Design an enzyme around this catalytic site. Structure first.
Site, PDB file in Angstrom:
ATOM      1  N   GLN A 191      25.534 -12.504 -18.647  1.00 46.78           N
ATOM      2  CA  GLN A 191      26.668 -12.930 -19.436  1.00 46.78           C
ATOM      3  C   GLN A 191      26.723 -12.110 -20.748  1.00 46.78           C
ATOM      4  O   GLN A 191      27.780 -11.887 -21.306  1.00 46.78           O
ATOM      5  CB  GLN A 191      26.528 -14.407 -19.782  1.00 46.78           C
ATOM      6  CG  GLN A 191      27.672 -14.990 -20.574  1.00 46.78           C
ATOM      7  CD  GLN A 191      28.895 -15.038 -19.758  1.00 46.78           C
ATOM      8  OE1 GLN A 191      28.819 -15.099 -18.545  1.00 46.78           O
ATOM      9  NE2 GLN A 191      30.054 -14.959 -20.406  1.00 46.78           N
ATOM     10  N   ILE A 216      28.455 -19.771 -20.294  1.00 49.24           N
ATOM     11  CA  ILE A 216      27.284 -19.790 -19.389  1.00 49.24           C
ATOM     12  C   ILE A 216      27.636 -19.112 -18.088  1.00 49.24           C
ATOM     13  O   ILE A 216      28.635 -19.428 -17.513  1.00 49.24           O
ATOM     14  CB  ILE A 216      26.782 -21.248 -19.024  1.00 49.24           C
ATOM     15  CG1 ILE A 216      26.474 -22.078 -20.254  1.00 49.24           C
ATOM     16  CG2 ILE A 216      25.557 -21.212 -18.031  1.00 49.24           C
ATOM     17  CD1 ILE A 216      26.347 -23.601 -20.035  1.00 49.24           C
ATOM     18  N   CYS A 217      26.805 -18.182 -17.638  1.00 52.79           N
ATOM     19  CA  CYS A 217      26.912 -17.565 -16.332  1.00 52.79           C
ATOM     20  C   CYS A 217      25.936 -18.260 -15.345  1.00 52.79           C
ATOM     21  O   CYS A 217      24.710 -17.954 -15.344  1.00 52.79           O
ATOM     22  CB  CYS A 217      26.540 -16.103 -16.376  1.00 52.79           C
ATOM     23  SG  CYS A 217      26.491 -15.324 -14.720  1.00 52.79           S
ATOM     24  N   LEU A 218      26.488 -19.204 -14.557  1.00 53.29           N
ATOM     25  CA  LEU A 218      25.710 -20.012 -13.580  1.00 53.29           C
ATOM     26  C   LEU A 218      26.640 -20.367 -12.423  1.00 53.29           C
ATOM     27  O   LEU A 218      27.729 -20.870 -12.639  1.00 53.29           O
ATOM     28  CB  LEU A 218      25.112 -21.276 -14.225  1.00 53.29           C
ATOM     29  CG  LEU A 218      24.137 -22.113 -13.353  1.00 53.29           C
ATOM     30  CD1 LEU A 218      22.997 -21.309 -12.809  1.00 53.29           C
ATOM     31  CD2 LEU A 218      23.612 -23.412 -14.073  1.00 53.29           C
ATOM     32  N   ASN A 230      21.988 -14.827 -19.568  1.00 53.27           N
ATOM     33  CA  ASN A 230      23.103 -15.484 -18.848  1.00 53.27           C
ATOM     34  C   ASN A 230      23.898 -16.466 -19.707  1.00 53.27           C
ATOM     35  O   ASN A 230      24.683 -17.244 -19.201  1.00 53.27           O
ATOM     36  CB  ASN A 230      22.609 -16.143 -17.575  1.00 53.27           C
ATOM     37  CG  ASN A 230      21.781 -15.206 -16.732  1.00 53.27           C
ATOM     38  OD1 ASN A 230      22.296 -14.325 -16.062  1.00 53.27           O
ATOM     39  ND2 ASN A 230      20.493 -15.327 -16.843  1.00 53.27           N
TER      40      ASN A 230
END
Ligand SMILES: [Ca+2]
Length: 202
Positions: free
Chosen positions: A128, A93-95, A85
């Site tokens: 990600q 960042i994938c959050l 991610n």
């Protein structure tokens, strides 16, 4: 600078909160003022225990928006990291808290703590970085050893594969850029030949 009063006062307050927190006195998180204005911060988180990231320390670029606290900070990993991610290339960042699930009650502290939790629980089916996410699913033990090697080389974690380290030193002694080598080898399942073929195409 100057930002709006609501933004300034929220940031001063969250920055003090991180300073006084137990997490920062246990060396798990910290924040550094880059900018007298409060618009740019540098964060640091420790890798959680019992993960490939343990022993590492990961620096973060935090940019505060003019619209704070009603939009999230823009956060990126400055320290290179191997995680489904997080982009191995950009640190992007994938959050969900940094995208559509931000809430105005969240703080610098809870964002750092949430990123440490993300290191301890990747979600490979919404990735990600597709190459990392594929390795996580297709060869978990290889993923584990690669993340750990990145933690060691970029984040100051203690140990990594002797096997891997020797492949890197072979290709670097052959005259390639060390970071290009780590990336080539990590992306090509640690195969010297197709790693080398990828390196020879630059
Ligand atoms: Ca202004």
């Amino acid at each position: 600078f100057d930002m709006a009063n609501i933004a300034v006062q929220r940031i001063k307050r969250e920055f003090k909160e991180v300073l006084k927190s137990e997490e920062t006195s246990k060396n798990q998180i910290k924040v550094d003022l880059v900018d007298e204005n409060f618009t740019e911060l540098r964060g640091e988180i420790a890798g959680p225990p019992d993960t490939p990231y343990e022993g590492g320390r990961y620096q973060l670029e935090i940019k505060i928006p003019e619209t704070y606290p009603f939009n999230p900070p823009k956060v990126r990993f400055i320290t290179k990291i191997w995680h489904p991610n997080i982009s191995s290339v950009t640190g992007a960042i994938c959050l969900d808290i940094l995208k559509d699930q931000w809430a105005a009650a969240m703080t610098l502290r809870t964002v750092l703590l949430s990123l440490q939790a993300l290191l301890a629980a990747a979600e490979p089916d919404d990735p990600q970085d597709a190459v990392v996410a594929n390795q996580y699913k297709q060869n978990p033990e290889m993923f584990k050893q690669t993340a750990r090697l990145w933690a060691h080389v970029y984040a100051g974690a203690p140990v990594s594969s002797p096997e891997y380290t020797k492949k890197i030193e072979n290709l670097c002694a052959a005259g390639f850029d060390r970071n290009a080598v780590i990336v080539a080898l990590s992306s090509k399942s640690w195969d010297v030949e197709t790693a080398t073929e990828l390196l020879l195409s630059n």
